[PDB]
Amino acid sequence: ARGPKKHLKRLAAPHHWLLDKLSGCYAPRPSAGPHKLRESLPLIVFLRNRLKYALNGREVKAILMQRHVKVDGKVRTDTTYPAGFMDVITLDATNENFRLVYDVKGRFAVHRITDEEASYKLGKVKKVQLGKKGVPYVVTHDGRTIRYPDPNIKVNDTVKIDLASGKITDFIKFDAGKLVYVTGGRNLGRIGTIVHKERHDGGFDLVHIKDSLDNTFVTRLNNVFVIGEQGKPYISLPKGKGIKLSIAEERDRRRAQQGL
Amino acid sequence: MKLNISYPVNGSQKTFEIDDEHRIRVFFDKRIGQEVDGEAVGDEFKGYVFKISGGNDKQ
Amino acid sequence: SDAVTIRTRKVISNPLLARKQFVVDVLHPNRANVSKDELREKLAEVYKAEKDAVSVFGFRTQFGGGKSVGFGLVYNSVAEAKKFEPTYRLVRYGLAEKVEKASRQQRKQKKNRDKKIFGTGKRLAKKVARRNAD
RNA sequence: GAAACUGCGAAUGGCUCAUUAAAUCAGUUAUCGUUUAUUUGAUAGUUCCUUUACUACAUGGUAUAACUGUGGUAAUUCUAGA
RNA sequence: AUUCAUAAUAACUUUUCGAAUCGCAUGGCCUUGUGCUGGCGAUGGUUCAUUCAAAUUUCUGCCCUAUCAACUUUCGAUGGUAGGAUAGUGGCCUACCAUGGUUUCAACGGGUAACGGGGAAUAAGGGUUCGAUUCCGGAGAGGGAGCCUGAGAAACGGCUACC
């Protein structure tokens, strides 16, 4: 009440951060940024908890302000900077890069990309609109406004950013039989190929997605994220490829690995 | 009462006590900004002209 | 000999802090525990360090004694160790000295006393001096 | 780097359950009915005195805190005159 | 789905913004000069988008009571038109007009030793009872009312008045 909140109590934090219940009363409240705080991964959570490069928040601040970590090629010394889906994190040391994608178990995963993959990213068009002076623009999911887009670009389409300059190199239309990603709902982390989409005027269009080995499911259009055509994706996939194999099947792989 | 009389061109300021309350009534029923002679105020102020800039009552 | 048999595990290079982190297990039969200074020294001649770039944590001994496990950092020099490590552990290891601060309550009380003062206060100091010397 | 001016915060947190019975709240909606500091992305070649006033843009001036001093009140994080 | 986004014409403005700001390196060309030209940032700064929000908001769902059966409406009750006011919709307020609106499918009134919920105890199944209290939402800072500064307060470790 009386104004915006500044504290995020622990157990109110998003569960996919995988914060422990003890060792703290509060959780890192992500700052205002490109991503909504529910589906954003703060740099303190990614460093201290996911990468174990820091032991405490003070060391996290020491890492951040030195101009070590650059998010999408920009330093962003904010501790709770809301890094989200498809974001590219480059580290000056160790000569390696991470992309931020979910795993099939519905949480952001440490995925290592090369430099050529780090040199770009894919985003989802939230809207296409004419601005002042009639310049058209596309708004991605990460709050990027790019002027003069291709006229064939429509809403919920995928655009490849150059990440060093605010331009689009190419795009993928929203059409049937194109490999996609899921960023919402119970299917958080899946990767599949479209079957069709239902019209459903007035709100909440529904899309039917088929997995690699025919695990057919449906989800809202809001959660869909086109990533390529049949095979040959534009983004290297994380460990798992978002398939959601059964509990008994992963039990088989675990007893295979430790039972040899 | 006491008079915080200040000469501004050199920034000098001194306090003079003026008893004989039947002579401080030249100040009476005047207000800030009203010029008053120095002759009635005192036998020391021949030709000095003052003006009221402020004050502090008892309390 | 005593045969501590100090083994380092979970070793990770962290050039982001110019240090290597690890957990360390020490096996000390018929011995209570291991001293931090001697453990830091042994880590120094293991890593060809100079006994000052080494920091240690924990060493929660198992039940019944005989084995301790704790965290450890080995740096590249004194300079980044002194810039990255906390003051309290610097005072532990003897590089720096504990700063003589007043207790927290009287520090706060003095700050609240200074809140009631506008400016330096030499004006009111000489005014109360005049009132005391009238 | 004391002080002070400026900026920002102080609307968060923390506490309590008095009020409150379609009120609050829960799930679910709408803003094609609005405000939004700050973060992130983009984003002002046009200022011709409100023209026959282009007079400094190698860059306009006022008035003040702080500080120096005179003080008043028993007293307040009171303050006035220069 | 629009009188949308935009764009064009005609004008209007206590004429809003369009850098008289700060730190490092201080290069290139000679017309060798208080010559020309230059990066890394920081704080700013109209507008759009994004984010953290907020405010209103649709549907459905609350305990006991008829020893509570009618209730609301000159003093806004329910609508219409226009205006005012607000960030904006809207009887929110005003003027004029119409006479509506709820109710035994329990309105209205009264009581609550009532903050609501996630939940807790018990539990064959079905249920019963509790939830001031860790999380979320609301409300309040002795009781009312009013208000300044601000993006955000009807703030109280802000102010003003009364008790």
Ligand SMILES: [K+]
């Ligand atoms: K009306």
Ligand SMILES: [Mg+2]
């Ligand atoms: Mg609060």
Ligand SMILES: [Mg+2]
């Ligand atoms: Mg109206």
Ligand SMILES: [Mg+2]
């Ligand atoms: Mg109550």
Ligand SMILES: [Mg+2]
């Ligand atoms: Mg409760």
Ligand SMILES: [Mg+2]
């Ligand atoms: Mg109670």
Ligand SMILES: [Mg+2]
């Ligand atoms: Mg609460």
Ligand SMILES: [Mg+2]
């Ligand atoms: Mg309140």
Ligand SMILES: [Mg+2]
């Ligand atoms: Mg009390």
Ligand SMILES: [Mg+2]
């Ligand atoms: Mg403010």
Ligand SMILES: [Mg+2]
């Ligand atoms: Mg109040």
Ligand SMILES: [Mg+2]
């Ligand atoms: Mg208090």
Ligand SMILES: [Mg+2]
């Ligand atoms: Mg408070």
